Design an enzyme around this catalytic site. Structure first.
Site, PDB file in Angstrom:
ATOM      1  N   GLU A 166      47.273  55.404  26.058  1.00 25.21           N
ATOM      2  CA  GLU A 166      47.182  56.678  25.364  1.00 25.21           C
ATOM      3  C   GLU A 166      47.515  56.515  23.883  1.00 25.21           C
ATOM      4  OE1 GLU A 166      49.875  59.397  27.208  1.00 25.21           O
ATOM      5  OE2 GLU A 166      51.637  58.103  26.985  1.00 25.21           O
ATOM      6  N   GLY A 206      55.462  54.438  35.073  1.00 23.52           N
ATOM      7  CA  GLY A 206      54.176  54.967  34.671  1.00 23.52           C
ATOM      8  C   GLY A 206      53.000  54.132  35.137  1.00 23.52           C
ATOM      9  N   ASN A 261      67.942  53.493  33.725  1.00 24.06           N
ATOM     10  CA  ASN A 261      68.242  54.552  32.768  1.00 24.06           C
ATOM     11  C   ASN A 261      69.550  55.259  33.082  1.00 24.06           C
ATOM     12  OD1 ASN A 261      64.828  54.950  32.801  1.00 24.06           O
ATOM     13  ND2 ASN A 261      65.915  54.663  30.861  1.00 24.06           N
ATOM     14  N   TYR A 271      66.503  59.430  24.063  1.00 27.94           N
ATOM     15  CA  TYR A 271      65.929  58.121  24.358  1.00 27.94           C
ATOM     16  C   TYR A 271      66.092  57.151  23.201  1.00 27.94           C
ATOM     17  CZ  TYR A 271      63.691  59.542  28.708  1.00 27.94           C
ATOM     18  OH  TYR A 271      63.450  59.960  29.998  1.00 27.94           O
ATOM     19  N   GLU A 293      65.376  27.841  29.861  1.00 26.08           N
ATOM     20  CA  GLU A 293      66.610  27.579  30.584  1.00 26.08           C
ATOM     21  C   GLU A 293      67.116  28.785  31.366  1.00 26.08           C
ATOM     22  OE1 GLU A 293      69.335  25.989  27.739  1.00 26.08           O
ATOM     23  OE2 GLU A 293      68.083  24.239  27.311  1.00 26.08           O
TER      24      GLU A 293
HETATM   25  N1  LIG Z   1      64.221  52.931  28.746  1.00 25.80           N
HETATM   26  C1  LIG Z   1      63.318  53.878  28.494  1.00 25.80           C
HETATM   27  N2  LIG Z   1      62.549  54.334  29.479  1.00 25.80           N
HETATM   28  C2  LIG Z   1      61.704  55.298  29.077  1.00 25.80           C
HETATM   29  C3  LIG Z   1      61.560  55.826  27.820  1.00 25.80           C
HETATM   30  N3  LIG Z   1      60.587  56.811  27.817  1.00 25.80           N
HETATM   31  C4  LIG Z   1      60.169  56.856  29.058  1.00 25.80           C
HETATM   32  N4  LIG Z   1      60.807  55.963  29.873  1.00 25.80           N
HETATM   33  C5  LIG Z   1      60.587  55.756  31.311  1.00 25.80           C
HETATM   34  O1  LIG Z   1      59.217  55.478  31.520  1.00 25.80           O
HETATM   35  C6  LIG Z   1      58.796  56.039  32.784  1.00 25.80           C
HETATM   36  C7  LIG Z   1      57.612  56.947  32.569  1.00 25.80           C
HETATM   37  O2  LIG Z   1      56.419  56.144  32.477  1.00 25.80           O
HETATM   38  P1  LIG Z   1      55.709  55.713  31.130  1.00 25.80           P
HETATM   39  O3  LIG Z   1      56.233  54.342  30.755  1.00 25.80           O
HETATM   40  O4  LIG Z   1      55.914  56.648  30.012  1.00 25.80           O
HETATM   41  O5  LIG Z   1      54.148  55.558  31.396  1.00 25.80           O
HETATM   42  P2  LIG Z   1      53.092  54.613  30.674  1.00 25.80           P
HETATM   43  O6  LIG Z   1      53.190  53.234  31.298  1.00 25.80           O
HETATM   44  O7  LIG Z   1      53.393  54.555  29.232  1.00 25.80           O
HETATM   45  O8  LIG Z   1      51.625  55.183  30.902  1.00 25.80           O
HETATM   46  P3  LIG Z   1      51.122  56.609  31.395  1.00 25.80           P
HETATM   47  O9  LIG Z   1      51.850  56.968  32.633  1.00 25.80           O
HETATM   48  O10 LIG Z   1      49.615  56.490  31.593  1.00 25.80           O
HETATM   49  O11 LIG Z   1      51.380  57.558  30.234  1.00 25.80           O
HETATM   50  C8  LIG Z   1      60.029  56.710  33.385  1.00 25.80           C
HETATM   51  O12 LIG Z   1      60.680  55.837  34.300  1.00 25.80           O
HETATM   52  C9  LIG Z   1      60.895  56.985  32.156  1.00 25.80           C
HETATM   53  O13 LIG Z   1      62.278  57.024  32.484  1.00 25.80           O
HETATM   54  C10 LIG Z   1      62.387  55.326  26.774  1.00 25.80           C
HETATM   55  O14 LIG Z   1      62.400  55.687  25.601  1.00 25.80           O
HETATM   56  N5  LIG Z   1      63.245  54.341  27.211  1.00 25.80           N
HETATM   57 MG   LIG Z   2      53.237  56.804  29.603  1.00 27.98          MG
END
Ligand SMILES: Nc1nc2c(ncn2[C@@H]2O[C@H](COP(=O)(O)OP(=O)(O)OP(=O)(O)O)[C@@H](O)[C@H]2O)c(=O)[nH]1
Ligand SMILES: [Mg+2]
Ligand SMILES: Nc1nc2c(ncn2[C@@H]2O[C@H](COP(=O)(O)OP(=O)(O)OP(=O)(O)O)[C@@H](O)[C@H]2O)c(=O)[nH]1
Ligand SMILES: Nc1nc2c(ncn2[C@@H]2O[C@H](COP(=O)(O)OP(=O)(O)O)[C@@H](O)[C@H]2O)c(=O)[nH]1
Ligand SMILES: Nc1nc2c(ncn2[C@@H]2O[C@H](COP(=O)(O)OP(=O)(O)O)[C@@H](O)[C@H]2O)c(=O)[nH]1
Ligand SMILES: [Mg+2]
Lengths: 429, 432, 429, 432
Positions: D62, D134, D197, D215, D245
């Protein structure tokens, strides 16, 4: 006495010679104007071997410069040490080579060679007692190959007893500058085996390695590569331009290095070669010269000497050194490397010692080695030649200039008559 | 003194020349008046005053695009007896280019070429800039290439054609004009370089990030190739090359002389940073199948010979390392009978930047001139379009009525099919 | 005469050697530039044993530096005394060890050992009469274990009669730097029992104690720990670099300390060692050297000598002392500690006396002791090895590099053939 | 010259990278323009000018979060051909990540990785920063880990995943996406670090005394772990460690490569005083079960191997005293077959402080990378959530219609249950 006429040919033979006369002038102390600004008096004792005394204490080189297009001559006269050559010696044509052997030896070779030999014969009748000629060319191009081997066929008819040595640039194994360079090399070696007395095979690929592995240069231009070749060309006649303890010349290195009249393709080597920030950690003594010659990363031809056998080996040392320490090192490399030499020639190391080093170093050597490891050099050309000739590709540029297949077939058959000799004496006993 | 005149035929020839001669003037500081505040004596002739004129002959059958030159900025530069025009255009017609209209002014152009051939002595060859599409670029060129091999003969004649695109075709009768002009130039031309329009649109969209290029922006990228070929004549180089040397190293058989040009690096000014652009980097950008300027996949065929023309701050050792890695790759393959397939040329002068352009000031640039058998697929589809239209005898009544034998099509198609199997003869391997 | 070629390997073998050449240069008076700034003339009498004379009164060490990643070599050349090593000796690879024995002795060992031995053979042919080599490595890592034992297997084929001693760093009992260090030690001791002549076992844990219990240091860095090891490495050959009353070398300490050709694992010790604010209360005389060697808080191996028996004991004294007072102290420790020695070897204390102390002290000693208390050292490795191998854990990193269980089984069986000898002669009569 | 490129996949990958590459620039004084007023050549490439670019490839399906980088403060730093975007997101769907959308740009990313692999020679390995939740972070990553083991193979591939929390779950289909991406990465990844998280919310509430973290504040604490792992490559240390290592000392069996990361000290600036923070103090803060960053009680299982990465003014003797007391405690227990369970690394450089942060300038810091069997309870409940939803065949109609075999769930669950009993094989002791 014992003068040398220098002949240049092609784009590459000019840019070696334009660096070659920059090294000779710095050994005799000659400005770019042409005067003399030396300090000692040994530099003018044998100045006649390359320089003719002009009127008013000026010395001009005994050089003859040949090209088929005026492009390379336009940069030689305009560069440094370009105002020292006599302007009558610049013999150039208006047509152009075309990077072709047929336009070098047949079509535009005959329109120019009758005008070059008016300059060769004039310089040869000016010398007191002529020693022999020398030529700098390349086997890849058209002018250094076609026009270059045409001059040797005309000279050897006029001057049979005078020696004739060429500093060729044999094309590299991996990369290739010219597409049709197997045709320009096979039709050139067929001329050199019957017209020259000794020939120095130099590969470009072996010079890119030494600037990268030994001297450690980031950006080696052709000013850096051709400075190593010009140091070796002066290192052969250095026992003629300066007095020594055991003197040699272009005839002693021709007799003692050539056992058979077809086996006269050599490989040159130079020592010492140090890096920039590593010339203080290295003990620059006499056995450091010996161990740096014989190893395979210092040869100027892209062929490993371990595959073959050394027939004859010449070592030309310079500088004030001792004679026992020379014979100590030259013998020990003949006992531990006892298999890599040949059996039916006893004690095949030639020694020659001068007295004056090059400008900057304390002592130096020069390696002039014959070997059967250059059978790899001709088994690679003859493989690439028969790979192209069996399809008759790139052939109408040669056939359209008055040439038949018998010119090609007798050229390739002569090369396989040369490979069958180096393979013969490598296994003889 | 290695002089070389250039001939621009047709509207596609002239609008390349307005971007070529814009570029040659900026490399040597030449004003648009011809004045300036040696090495450039090849493409100019300094007169008794301090004024330099080009060694060019523009020719066209229509007076539209020539009046851009006679009224524009580069007005006082060209000799007004060179700009040869005509009353009426050939108008997408090979017969009007070669039989009707081209026969009326062919005696005038050869008189102007001979007046530029006599004041030179190191005349290497010619440079015909035309296009396979139009009537003047094909018909008048095929007449012109006949009259040069009769008069001069020995001089190496080069051509920078505009090969018609596989999908984008402006004129309808481009399969007719391409075959009839290739049946004629096959006996006379020595090396005819191919440049396609559609592949330059693919580069300007992807690399330069320009969404809407005009024909001006395409003529900038063409003239960079024209400069890098003749760069070794106009300056000093570490390893030069001449126009006689292109026809020897890239034309193995006399029927196969259609290479294709490829230029690199082509990047924008904001992308001119973030990457260092060494010669080991920009050499593989030439053999990449997304940066070739002819819409032909090179992995379908084999490379017969290649010619790399380096220019700029180029190290000769690093060229040797850059070519050696290409022969180790597996997608790039050469023909079996050619073990040594490279022509190498290094020039010192970096490529200059025309103002108002899109490419940035770089330190080095590579022009590749490769001769592959991957063009043999392109000749097949052009013969496929010719067989479809001629089966219905479409558009033939224009060509018959303008003085052409009707059976000359059947003589042209059988000769082109003979060219088609010649690539099949090359592509096979050998026994033992 | 009697030259020593120094070989380094790994991260630890570099950081011992980079401190080792800092101690040798301070005994002979060598600046970090490489020149000589000494005061007496005994320092240049035997300078050839470690230093080769370069051109211009500079001395460069006879060192060969080996690593599989360029990270540690980047800090050695940039640190102090890093501009004294010759830049050709820095032999490093681009891949990386990975802290694995299979990548040290099989995969990336074979791609590098053919380039290291071009440097070993060049230094060995430059020496007049070679004494023997030496190696500094660690059994825990991958480069000091895999590449380190690969060099010994290639050297002993070429040079059988020359001695070969290693200064290993045996891993500590309590803490453990590497998780797979029992695998990297068991596959290394199997190579050292058939290729070396004597081996110095050093534990890190025994060095943290001496800096905490004896020298009383608040923050001992590795510059403080490796300064004690480098004082012991120089203390063995100190009877070779300087004249003395009863001279020894690397051969007298090899004959008199090794009764059986498998029993050659030692433990080193150094004396005197004083604290900072307590070096004035202590009477630094000759019997203070004796009582500080034999007690168990001064050994450099984490094993108590009271559990075993001393087979042979070497004491190398330095400085102007008397010979009666040496034989007084060495005999009395053999009468009151009469059970802790062995019975079937009479008078098993070797004496060697030099003349020149280290820089700073008045006199000093060096303890080179053999014992059967190092059977605790191999009963702890073989216990940890069979605890991991019976689960076949951490094994696919070794099996995936071309290795079978017979490589492991014959390694562990050889170690239990070594434990059954030290347990045998401890109870023999 | 030990170079290492890093790959950021998904929105959770990018917003960690905006806090990672913020941190690497401040450690070496790099401006946001890439300029600066050596040792840092691992994670950068100095061009012909004085400009440094990261060796990073951001990728997302995206275009929302990538336009933060193209318009924000760190705009002139990244090469614009690296920031690979897509038209539409995978939108919480493994099938769109691996079959439908991920197949359309996977050829473009591998072309950009190979252009960063060729200009390095000491390339140790990769760093894939993704998330199990995601669609892009799971589906496109599982496609990417297949294409790297085919092309490269020998290079050590590390992953910093975002393991889904036991209670806090944003997406509903997180049990579906976690199993399908762990069935695929199990054959290709070498060591996949776990960071949760919810456990970072427990630390920021209790230790740092921040009641409302965003975040951004979580990505600061993640990037401190990323820095301390690659701290030994970018500087000189007394006892270094490399990325080759980590996979040797923490992965005993090829099916068990899921460690968990733990960082200490994490204290506020007003609490940075009142305590001295020696290495004997802050080492026991790592093995304390309240400061671990994965919601798993470590006293339920056993530690297989641990890796302590010290940095700062750290005495090597006092490390030996600090580890020795841990093996004397009774709550901390190791597995019976591993007597030597520590990997020790000391670096000299103290951890830097990003401005506007919450942690204070300290003199020393510890990063622990421990591989325990206490994660085996976490895999059980994730398989318990998968069996509940799949028994009713909920949400399956999205995954079947996007090009996936329906029985691939039954192949994924049987392979994960095989992973479940592998921890039971390890946890038992031995006879004699
Ligand atoms: N550590 C961390 N995890 C995050 C953050 N923003 C979102 N997440 C985690 O990411 C997950 C949501 O999926 P996304 O990674 O946003 O999805 P994507 O792989 O980018 O792709 P789409 O689902 O198609 O938008 C959840 O487990 C959230 O807790 C962040 O800033 N830090
Ligand atoms: Mg995403
Ligand atoms: N590269 C390039 N091609 C052009 C340009 N303008 C037109 N063309 C191409 O030229 C072809 C059309 O033929 P023209 O050259 O215009 O025709 P002509 O030879 O001048 O003769 P007439 O048809 O009689 O006017 C098409 O293939 C166009 O794509 C230009 O600026 N650059
Ligand atoms: N060593 C060296 N070789 C050169 C140089 N210039 C050209 N060459 C070589 O010369 C060959 C090309 O031939 P060239 O002399 O230019 O063609 P010709 O003028 O038609 O004879 C190739 O093998 C090049 O590698 C140079 O400056 N130094
Ligand atoms: N005495 C000492 N031991 C060290 C030093 N550096 C590392 N070690 C030890 O060396 C071992 C680690 O091996 P290492 O050489 O780094 O791995 P390798 O490079 O793959 O051989 C451990 O037993 C460390 O205790 C040092 O400076 N001094
Ligand atoms: Mg037109």
């Amino acid at each position: 006495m014992r003068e040398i006429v220098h002949i240049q040919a092609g784009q590459c033979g000019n840019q070696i010679g334009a660096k070659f006369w920059e090294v000779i002038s710095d050994e005799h102390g000659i400005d770019p104007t042409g005067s003399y600004h030396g300090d000692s008096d040994l530099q003018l004792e044998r100045i006649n071997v390359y320089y003719n005394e002009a009127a008013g204490n000026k010395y001009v080189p005994r050089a003859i410069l040949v090209d088929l297009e005026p492009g390379t001559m336009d940069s030689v006269r305009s560069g440094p040490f370009g105002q020292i050559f006599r302007p009558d010696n610049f013999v150039f044509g208006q047509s152009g080579a075309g990077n072709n052997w047929a336009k070098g030896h047949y079509t535009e070779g005959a329109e120019l060679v009758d005008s070059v030999l008016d300059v060769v014969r004039k310089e040869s009748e000016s010398c007191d007692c002529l020693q022999g000629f020398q030529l700098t060319h390349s086997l890849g191009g058209g002018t250094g190959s076609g026009m270059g081997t045409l001059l040797i066929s005309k000279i050897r008819e006029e001057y049979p007893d005078r020696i004739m040595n060429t500093f060729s640039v044999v094309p590299s194994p991996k990369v290739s500058d010219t597409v049709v360079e197997p045709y320009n090399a096979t039709l050139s070696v067929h001329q050199l085996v019957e017209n020259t007395d000794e020939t120095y095979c130099i590969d470009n690929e072996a010079l890119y390695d030494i600037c990268f592995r030994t001297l450690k240069l980031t950006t080696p231009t052709y000013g850096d590569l051709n400075h190593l070749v010009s140091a070796t060309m002066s290192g052969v006649t250095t026992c003629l331009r300066f007095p020594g303890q055991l003197n040699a010349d272009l005839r002693k290195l021709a007799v003692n290095m050539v056992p058979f009249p077809r086996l006269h393709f050599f490989m040159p080597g130079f020592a010492p070669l140090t890096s920039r920030g590593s010339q203080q950690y290295r003990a620059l003594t006499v056995p450091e010269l010996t161990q740096q010659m014989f190893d395979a990363k210092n040869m100027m031809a892209a062929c490993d000497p371990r595959h073959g056998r050394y027939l004859t080996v010449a070592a030309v040392f310079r500088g004030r050194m001792s004679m026992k320490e020379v014979d100590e090192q030259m013998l020990n490399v003949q006992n531990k490397n006892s298999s890599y030499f040949v059996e039916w020639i006893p004690n095949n190391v030639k020694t020659a010692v001068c007295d004056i080093p090059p400008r900057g170093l304390k002592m130096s050597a020069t390696f002039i080695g014959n070997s059967t490891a250059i059978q790899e050099l001709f088994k690679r050309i003859s493989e690439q030649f028969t790979a192209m000739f069996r399809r008759k590709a790139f052939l109408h540029w040669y056939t359209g200039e008055g040439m038949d297949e018998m010119e090609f077939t007798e050229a390739e058959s002569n090369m396989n008559d040369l490979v069958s000799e180096y393979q013969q004496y490598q296994d003889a006993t | 003194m290695r002089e070389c005149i250039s001939i621009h035929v047709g509207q596609a020839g002239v609008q390349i020349g307005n971007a070529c001669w814009e570029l040659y003037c900026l490399e040597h500081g030449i004003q648009p008046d011809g004045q300036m505040p040696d090495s450039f004596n090849t493409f100019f002739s300094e007169t008794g005053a301090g004024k330099h004129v080009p060694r060019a002959v523009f020719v066209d059958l229509e007076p539209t695009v020539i009046d851009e030159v006679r009224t524009g900025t580069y007005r006082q530069l060209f000799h007004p007896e060179q700009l040869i025009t005509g009353k009426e255009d050939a108008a997408n017609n090979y017969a009007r280019g070669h039989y009707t209209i081209g026969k009326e002014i062919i005696d005038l152009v050869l008189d102007r070429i001979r007046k530029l051939a006599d004041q030179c002595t190191g005349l290497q060859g010619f440079l015909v800039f035309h296009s396979f599409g139009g009537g003047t670029g094909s018909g008048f060129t095929s007449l012109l290439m006949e009259r040069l091999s009769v008069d001069y003969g020995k001089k190496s004649k080069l051509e920078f054609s505009i090969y018609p695109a596989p999908q984008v075709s402006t004129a309808v009768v481009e399969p007719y004009n391409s075959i009839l002009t290739t049946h004629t130039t096959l006996e006379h031309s020595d090396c005819a370089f191919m440049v396609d329009n559609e592949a330059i649109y693919d580069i300007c969209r992807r690399n330069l990030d320009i969404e809407r290029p005009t024909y001006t922006n395409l003529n900038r990228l063409i003239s960079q190739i024209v400069s890098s070929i003749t760069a070794s004549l106009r300056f000093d180089g570490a390893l030069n090359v001449d126009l006689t040397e292109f026809q020897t190293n890239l034309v193995p058989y006399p029927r196969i002389h259609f290479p294709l040009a490829t230029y690199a690096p082509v990047i924008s000014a904001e992308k001119a940073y973030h990457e260092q652009l060494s010669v080991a980097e920009i050499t593989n950008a030439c053999f990449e199948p997304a940066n070739q300027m002819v819409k032909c996949d090179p992995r379908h065929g084999k490379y017969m010979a290649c010619c790399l023309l380096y220019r700029g701050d180029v190290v000769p050792k690093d060229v040797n390392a850059a070519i050696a890695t290409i022969k180790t790759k597996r997608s790039i393959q050469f023909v079996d009978w050619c073990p040594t397939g490279f022509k190498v040329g290094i020039n010192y002068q970096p490529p200059t930047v025309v103002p108002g352009g899109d490419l940035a000031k770089v330190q080095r640039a590579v022009c590749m001139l490769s001769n592959t058998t991957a063009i043999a697929e392109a000749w097949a589809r052009l013969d496929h379009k010719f067989d479809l239209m001629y089966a219905k005898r479409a558009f033939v009544h224009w060509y018959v009525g303008e003085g052409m034998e009707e059976g000359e099509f059947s003589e042209a198609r059988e000769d082109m099919a003979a060219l088609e199997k010649d690539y099949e003869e090359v592509g096979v391997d050998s026994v033992e």
